[PDB]
Symmetry: T
């Protein structure tokens, strides 16, 4: 998937999680998010296409994705314990990480 | 597994490695440690529950876990070459990384 | 594989990619590079054997390998879309990351 | 996934297919559509919740989905032969089946 | 399995579902029902042996089995969301399809 | 395989079954027919290329293939019970389903 | 499955074996009995719910189930050699093991 | 794992089960106990190293482990039905089997 | 395999173990012995054919096989730790169990 | 499959290859040819039934099949590199090996 | 297995086939012979240890084993068609290939 | 991989084997050589591109590769028994086969 498609997967699955009422739907959505983020961390955002690959910006992009992966993993961990509301709250807190990256590079 | 259970897995398997006398027992123990550390790096320690997820502390927690993973992988690499004493010595050196994190966040 | 063998795998596969004329050969070569880099990031270079594992040098070594992994993943992503010339150009740009690390630690 | 989510998947993947430039993207998108249609054909749409399961309406609903599945399969058959433009044209033509069902039951 | 044995499987598993108190038991029973229905839909029942394979009676028979499969799938979808009572109600609802076919052909 | 290839596979395997003398050969042949029919039911025959995808012709074509699949499955069921002659007789009778569709659409 | 369900499975499959006419049906039925007995041997029958887990009754119950498993395995071995009538006769003789346990604990 | 390690595993997982608040944790812990007991039943405890392999003592040792395995399996059967509190009570009751063997052979 | 053939397998593999000079050969032989013992324990030997299946003789026969399986497992556990000489000594030790059963029933 | 049926498979798939317009169709046909050749090389053809199995004629027959297998592998290697026209030319070239054997033994 | 072990396996399984009364036993035995021959063809017999690896002797040895493999495969093909007596007769005839090689190199 | 790359693989792995100090490295290297030789035996070397596929030269080329495969398999058989020095000596001896073919066809 291309970077924009991975972002759309992330966005769609937050909506699924928010409206879900059981752990299976939540786990499935978080698993799709994990895969999208694992594909996206190695991408180059359009606004950074002219920057050195080892630039502070590109390193910060990767770091932010690795942090998002950690938070998705932790939300999935709650969902695998069947803690639906807690997993949903963790997914809501994810948005702060999405937004922080977007402010810099989207 | 919860964070404390992953730590207990790490602790138990260092003891197994120290007393082991063959590469199979060592490889098995290191594989369990690898899995425990892969589950733990995305956790939030109790003493950091009120901190921002992107805080210097939380980033340092993750970094320390990624370093521990690298050292476990390298010890496993020795054990897979059947170098039992060298793998045991690498596992002993792991303790410095465990202790360094504990001084800050346990 | 030992560190030097992983480097040889990386070097051999850049040569394969450069001369290739189809996506299958390129994808295969990049997959071998991905595996070599995943094995190598946890190694200790000979020139850093006496340094603390958490030293700035060792952390920089790991970081550089994680960056190389990201660039390999991205080249593979192009090749999986069958974009042979673009994947070859991405592999050529990899060399800057190889060389930057070598200047410091080889 | 619930019926609304499966419909969203179908729509998203039509857009991916239309903008695609390689067979890998197209095949993956059509495979996702196949999965969504296989999940959806046994669902009950809101407007038919009070009808007999063997009503003309529910039978017509199932028949339209089996039609859609066949057309997706045919498009995927083109994409597996790497015929990107032909598979894109088949995907565009699917829309008549989407619209026919929506006119009756959405 | 022969037709009568597949029917006995369907009947046994509806009773298991009704008595169940958790989603695992329900899911396991519905999966057995799926398999029995997949194996039965292509059979010729005793009272239709002297009809043409393309006869309206045989076509009606196959159609009824396909509607049964859809309803079993829909009940399984609820059970996979851990909705035990809803899946149990869906399982009672599919008795309508059992009954309709039996009325004509058992 | 295109529709013509799938029809050739069906015809080849009827001949294999007729001349066979053991259940293994018959089961394999019937399994190949099942796969060919599964790939063919979603095709559009040449003489229906100008009909709507939901035309009465196309829906009759699909219905005939589902009939054929059922009769193949039923023959395979006899072969799986090692009833060679009965499975051969069921395969021979398949010809009336082949012929009926051919009269209309071949 | 609970103990009653496992006993129902055992009884259903004895009847399938008795009426069967080929090795495939017999092998499948015996495989289902093996699974039911494997799930049942660890159960506590109602009439022993008040006995110590290590009581002479409970140990006699487990011993009878291991006997039954052995005799099922031996019947399955005959069926796997395609010896239908011999496997049917072995299944019939199983009844003396069923009955002996029932006299004491059912 | 050696006998001492398998005993440690059994003890650790009893504690995990007692403190657990969801079926996933309980099922995983019971699965680990099943594996440890399957490894241990064929071991020779230090105090019996000079006894015949068919001695009353070694036979009693094996019998006690087969008992334990049955009780673990029964507890896991409850946990697979998501019956957390009931599975916890079954795990607590296992301790009588642990203690009975320890009194004789530890 | 029949009982005599499983016995021949056990005998051949003890000799392979004694002559072996490495753990791979020993492990492979012990795994073959496990399979032969698993297949034999449910048989009725010629000298016991006219005994009841629950007779003391048949119970003794099954018990001896279970003790054999435990001893093969214990030897395999040593071989998996690469302890060739210890596994070879364990393999000689299990001749006691072979002999005891043969004394009574061969 | 019997020898004649494996020959028919080889012949059908050469024609599929010639008519193909993409590498997937070619790869699939060559894989079927590999399997048919692997199954045929050990057969005795009618015109050689009264020759010794080590006769020059039978040795020549096996040799020709091994050369065929190599040429099918080499054509498959081209097709895996997506070189459709080159793989098609390699497929025409292997008719020399078909012809040579047929000259002597068909 | 060393060459002597592989030859013992070949001889054991000829005897199993000769005394067998069903296709399952024959197929298994022939499958074990196939594996033994596959492991043996690359060996160097004692009486050729002093010959060049490419000597006429060693190449004749390899050729005889490829002959044997072909005849084993052909016997297995008959067994897979459930032709027990024909497969037994093919196995008996294998002895002329065994004997021819033994006369030269055993 | 093309023929030149497979030759490079063979040469690289001889060097890995010669410098190795453990069986894991040796086994992996020999496995890679086996794969390279299996790919290469069906290739056509540049100097033989104008020869008949059944020419003495091409037949000799295939025969030399089958020899090489046998010798690699024999070396791997030693390495699987953990006989590092013996496997290294077998790998060194392979070189005579490499050189014999190169003298004729490189
Ligand atoms: C950096 C580390 C990011 C994180 C974490 C997330 N996103 Fe993102 N996002 C990022 C970039 C650089 C871009 C621009 C991509 C481009 O090709 O222009 C985006 C874009 C989006 C979009 C818009 C996609 C589109 O159709 O153009 C969405 C909807 C989006 N991102 C959502 C999203 C969510 C929900 C995230 C957290 C769960 C998230 N992103 C993380 C960079 C980064
Ligand atoms: C940070 C990067 C850490 C690394 C590396 C290791 N540990 Fe740890 N450990 C860490 C925290 C934050 C905590 C507190 C957890 C809590 O829930 O309070 C711990 C705790 C432990 C414990 C005690 C567990 C308990 O029962 O309370 C142990 C025994 C332990 N840790 C062991 C351990 C070992 C052996 C490690 C290296 C191999 C190791 N830890 C690494 C943080 C971090
Ligand atoms: C650090 C982050 C590195 C990256 C990225 C790459 N290489 Fe490397 N390389 C590194 C070290 C520390 C060493 C020394 C290893 C030793 O044991 O001495 C090397 C060595 C090489 C070699 C020489 C190997 C030898 O036979 O001695 C080669 C050919 C090589 N490296 C190639 C290579 C390529 C092609 C890379 C990018 C694709 C690359 N390396 C990355 C450190 C690092
Ligand atoms: C009947 C056989 C249908 C076919 C074929 C397709 N769709 Fe559909 N769609 C159908 C219904 C009954 C509904 C309403 C569901 C509800 O809960 O109200 C829908 C809805 C949609 C939507 C809206 C989803 C949402 O966000 O609420 C979309 C975007 C949609 N459908 C798309 C779609 C496409 C692209 C299809 C063909 C490829 C398609 N649908 C087929 C019934 C049927
Ligand atoms: C037609 C499409 C049917 C559907 C749907 C179901 N059943 Fe059925 N059933 C059908 C026939 C033609 C027959 C007669 C079979 C015969 O060989 O005589 C049956 C029979 C049964 C039986 C009796 C079987 C026996 O033990 O002899 C049972 C218990 C039964 N059917 C149950 C059943 C259930 C529970 C169904 C829905 C879940 C169901 N059937 C569907 C035809 C059809
Ligand atoms: C409709 C539901 C069909 C069924 C059932 C069967 N066949 Fe068919 N067949 C069908 C069509 C529309 C066509 C024309 C295909 C075309 O591209 O023109 C065919 C054709 C054949 C052929 C000729 C193939 C060729 O290369 O020209 C054969 C040999 C054939 N069909 C055989 C066949 C058999 C044996 C069937 C039953 C087992 C069978 N067909 C079923 C439509 C349908
Ligand atoms: C002890 C070792 C048993 C063996 C061997 C078999 N059965 Fe059994 N059976 C056993 C008990 C303790 C019970 C009572 C279960 C309860 O919950 O009360 C049963 C019961 C049955 C039943 C009745 C099931 C019901 O729904 O009431 C049947 C039909 C039955 N058992 C059949 C059966 C067969 C066919 C067996 C041999 C093949 C067999 N059982 C063995 C204990 C034991
Ligand atoms: C016999 C059938 C046993 C059963 C059932 C259980 N245990 Fe055990 N245990 C047994 C022996 C012979 C020994 C001594 C082993 C030795 O090497 O000395 C033990 C020991 C333990 C220990 C101590 C382990 C250690 O750290 O040295 C523990 C913690 C223990 N056993 C726990 C345990 C539990 C929780 C059990 C039931 C779930 C259990 N054991 C069963 C023999 C037997
Ligand atoms: C009872 C529990 C036994 C155990 C344990 C072992 N054997 Fe056995 N063996 C047993 C019987 C009843 C028989 C007679 C079988 C018959 O059909 O007559 C045998 C026979 C053998 C043989 C001879 C087989 C033959 O070629 O005819 C051998 C070589 C043999 N047994 C070896 C053997 C070994 C090595 C064992 C332990 C590893 C072993 N047996 C265990 C009963 C039992
Ligand atoms: C010897 C090594 C052969 C090679 C290589 C190929 N074929 Fe063959 N073929 C061979 C024989 C001995 C026979 C006669 C078989 C018999 O039972 O009479 C055949 C036959 C055929 C046939 C006719 C089969 C039929 O329908 O009766 C065909 C169509 C055929 N062969 C095709 C074929 C192709 C295309 C080959 C290369 C790709 C090929 N054969 C190789 C012997 C040998
Ligand atoms: C050459 C191509 C052979 C074929 C074909 C078969 N065998 Fe063989 N066998 C061969 C050699 C070189 C040797 C000597 C091995 C040694 O280490 O000295 C053997 C030996 C045997 C033996 C004796 C084994 C022992 O322990 O001494 C047996 C029982 C034997 N061979 C049986 C056998 C059978 C049954 C074959 C055909 C099915 C067969 N061999 C083929 C070389 C070759
Ligand atoms: C024939 C049966 C061969 C055997 C056995 C081996 N090699 Fe080879 N090799 C062969 C040819 C025809 C060629 C030339 C290919 C070409 O495209 O020109 C080669 C070439 C090599 C090379 C050079 C590769 C390069 O970088 O261009 C090497 C390094 C090589 N061969 C090594 C090698 C080794 C180590 C072998 C045995 C283990 C070996 N070859 C066997 C033909 C044959
Ligand atoms: Fe960092
Ligand atoms: Fe219809
Ligand atoms: Fe669950
Ligand atoms: Fe069979
Ligand atoms: Fe007992
Ligand atoms: Fe090993
Ligand atoms: Fe030859
Ligand atoms: Fe492709
Ligand atoms: Zn992607
Ligand atoms: Zn979307
Ligand atoms: Zn966890
Ligand atoms: Zn512990
Ligand atoms: Zn490595
Ligand atoms: Zn190289
Ligand atoms: Zn769904
Ligand atoms: Zn069936
Ligand atoms: Zn029943
Ligand atoms: Zn197709
Ligand atoms: Zn159960
Ligand atoms: Zn163990
Ligand atoms: Zn057996
Ligand atoms: Zn033997
Ligand atoms: Zn065949
Ligand atoms: Zn054909
Ligand atoms: Zn071997
Ligand atoms: Zn290749």
């Amino acid at each position: 998937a291309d970077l924009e498609d991975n972002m759309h997967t992330l966005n769609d699955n937050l909506k699924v999680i928010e409206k879900a009422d059981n752990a299976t739907t939540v786990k499935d959505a978080l698993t799709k998010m994990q895969a999208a983020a694992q594909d996206a961390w190695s991408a180059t955002p359009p606004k950074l296409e002219d920057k050195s690959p080892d630039s502070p910006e590109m390193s910060d992009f990767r770091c932010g994705f690795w942090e998002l992966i950690g938070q998705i993993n932790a939300a999935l961990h709650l969902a695998k314990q069947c803690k639906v509301k807690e997993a949903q709250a963790a997914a809501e807190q994810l948005k702060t990480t999405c937004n922080a990256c977007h402010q810099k590079y989207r």
